[PDB]
Design a protein around this ligand. Structure first.
Ligand SMILES: O=C(O)C1=C[C@H](O)[C@H](O)[C@H](O[C@H]2[C@H](O)[C@H](O)[C@H](O[C@H]3[C@H](O)[C@H](O)[C@H](O)O[C@@H]3C(=O)O)O[C@@H]2C(=O)O)O1
Ligand SMILES: O=C(O)C1=C[C@H](O)[C@H](O)[C@H](O[C@H]2[C@H](O)[C@H](O)[C@H](O[C@H]3[C@H](O)[C@H](O)[C@H](O)O[C@@H]3C(=O)O)O[C@@H]2C(=O)O)O1
Lengths: 380, 380
């Protein structure tokens, strides 16, 4: 049985079982994934300290990014304070190296850790561990366990927790570290350091004002906060807290954010409303991968008002079939393929075979290098 | 009379004459522009050599960018060859510093040169000259006079001239250097070096295979090629060639690109078809700013085939009133404010009061720091 973590454990256990039996289709698929993963064996580990412009703490180990929809105001001599254009990414975001480097690290650690679980090859644990040590626990290169300066905004006077949603890029890699435990390359000292980092990160996100505020956000930020929260708690093996989070935070959030007709009105007021409805359900999808490993199905368990997450999928399904029929603001085209994994996840959790069939009809490319698609041979 | 250059010379002369007469409205506007321009006096001059990853020539003085719509192919192990997603800008473009640095230099040099022309204050010529020297003529920091590696694409086997369109961000700055001739800071030796650079760049764009190809492009690339061409030719005082380019290349190109209803079919097949319809006419607008300084009006002069550029403005005008009425693919919102200067330019050249009225109704923000709007107090 697969360790508790941020992945479809059923699909991952099935892939490993078939790989070890020498099942030909799976063996070839994993051999393709190994050719994809070679670049991560070669990759120099990234660090949040690889920036020149320091955060207000003067600590290069503090994560800092620009909130993506905030732009300099041309009518101000210094451009300050920045103003918001919902749905229009300011290219200035690429001036903060950790926005993309956290994504590159997360991909590399996720791919390598999953390949170690499937194949048992030490080379993948050794390379996974190298990325994990440098990003997380190194006393010089490792990130401080906080998101204080995530999605900062020039000129903004108030503190926000909005940037915490950036954590999902590296909290998935934190969770996969559970998969390399027991390797030779991941020592007891490595585990204790990362256990301590994860405990300090969990403390920060539960007790800092920014973490508290993000825990109560009325939209997909609150849903993603608990997805991240569950990844951290599952890394730390706190299964009682996972039950408590789902019952006391995730379910009440669903019950409030799903309307009677199954729409998500907080996402409907965005300029990318079909993307943000989908993104809210992707948060529930990642939360569910974890809750369902301990017996809780987030797709069909009702809130106290009887609302269920499947209602939100039902509402969106015809627009996954035909995005052009979407009737709310969507100022960039919607990528239909983001529905494939989502409809598969929800479909199998609900026994809804129309959803699974559509997940496969949409599908994913067999040879794609997108690391989140590794477990989904079933869609390829 | 203002020196020949890439600006509305009528508006620039009017601003200078009013400023010298102490007219209050103009004097206040220019004092705002002087506050805006302060950042450029302090800003450290940029150079194309400020890059890490070198181009295939191994020369940091070669300009190099990535063609913006080309992306790694995730179904290939190394992502190669890149594939095209029209209208979707790959954020990898920001890994090539001269993409945005050419923009920043172009803004800095344009603003300072225009302010030296209006105010006569030497401090603007001194700073303008500092930017010009470093970007263009410096024997270590100045760019080589070519665009061989502009908008290169990883894995593409053929040479393209498509990246030449990048030149417009610095060819306007080249044009404005004429405005600081006669200042104390811009010496005869300075002018001589920039004359030689511009002569070599003109040779490259006219005789290189890439320049030849871009000069033959049947869409807005061909229009921008000649607008840049006219800027280089005007800087070099080749008024006889300006006339020849207008009559033998620009007007025939414009006439071949306009369909019977005034639409631009080459731009209509783009995913950003309202933007590229406008971008094609913006090339003609900047070309006309120069030709009309020697008596050639590109908006009203018919081509050989009876087509005239006013017909294309006429087709687009209702969609400038209501961009939501646009019936062709436009996968990002169209910025209506780009119609302001365009309709003013075309309206004034055509004596079309309806166009000028809408230009002022749409308007530009009085306090904006966008350097391209400096001559347009009339719209603010
Ligand atoms: O929705 C997301 O997951 C998301 C991801 C991006 O990285 C940003 O974090 C972005 O955050 C949004 C946030 O979700 C809200 O829509 C918020 O809206 C508020 C505005 O910022 C203004 O303050 C407005 O007056 O009120 C809004 C509100 O509270 O509804 O904006 C942020 C943002 O763009 O920073 O979305
Ligand atoms: O239109 C522009 O000014 C423009 C600016 C961008 O920076 C790019 O240079 C982009 O160039 C376009 C170009 O205008 C054409 O649309 C071209 O189309 C060709 C495609 O690249 C393929 O080769 C296709 O098979 O044929 C197309 C054709 O010839 O119409 O694409 C480039 C580009 O995106 O590289 O536009």
């Amino acid at each position: 049985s697969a360790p508790l973590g941020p992945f479809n454990a059923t699909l991952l256990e099935q892939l490993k079982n078939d790989y070890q039996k020498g099942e030909k289709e799976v063996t070839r698929y994993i051999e393709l994934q190994e050719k994809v993963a070679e670049k991560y064996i070669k990759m120099t580990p990234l660090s949040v300290t690889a920036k020149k412009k320091l955060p207000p703490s003067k600590d290069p180990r503090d994560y800092m990014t620009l909130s993506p929809y905030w732009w300099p105001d041309s009518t101000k001599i210094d451009g300050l304070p920045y103003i918001r254009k919902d749905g229009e990414r300011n290219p200035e975001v690429y001036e903060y190296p950790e926005r993309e480097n956290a994504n590159r690290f997360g991909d590399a650690a996720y791919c390598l850790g999953v390949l170690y679980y499937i194949t048992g090859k030490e080379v993948y644990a050794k390379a996974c561990a190298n990325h994990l040590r440098t990003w997380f626990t190194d006393p010089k290169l490792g990130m401080n366990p906080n998101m204080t300066y995530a999605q900062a905004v020039p000129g903004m006077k108030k503190m926000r927790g909005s940037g915490f949603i950036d954590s999902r890029r590296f909290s998935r890699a934190l969770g996969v570290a559970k998969l390399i435990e027991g390797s030779k390359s991941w020592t007891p000292s490595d585990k204790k350091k990362l256990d301590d980092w994860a405990t300090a990160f969990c403390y920060w996100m539960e007790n800092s004002t920014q973490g508290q505020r993000e825990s109560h956000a009325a939209n997909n930020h609150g849903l993603w906060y608990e997805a991240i929260h569950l990844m951290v708690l599952a890394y730390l093996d706190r299964t009682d807290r996972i039950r408590e989070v789902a019952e006391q935070s995730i379910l009440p959030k669903m019950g409030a954010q799903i309307a009677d007709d199954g729409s998500l009105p907080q996402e409907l007021k965005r300029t990318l409303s079909l993307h943000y409805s989908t993104f809210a359900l992707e948060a529930l999808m990642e939360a569910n991968q974890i809750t369902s490993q301990i017996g809780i199905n987030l797709w069909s368990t009702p809130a106290s008002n009887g609302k269920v997450a499947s209602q939100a999928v039902d509402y969106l399904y015809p627009f996954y079939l035909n995005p052009e029929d979407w009737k709310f603001k969507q100022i960039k085209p919607f990528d239909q393929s983001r529905a494939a994994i989502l409809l598969y996840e929800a479909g199998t959790a609900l026994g809804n075979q129309k959803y699974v069939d559509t997940a496969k009809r949409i599908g994913l490319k067999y040879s794609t290098s997108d690391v989140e698609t590794i477990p989904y041979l079933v869609l390829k």
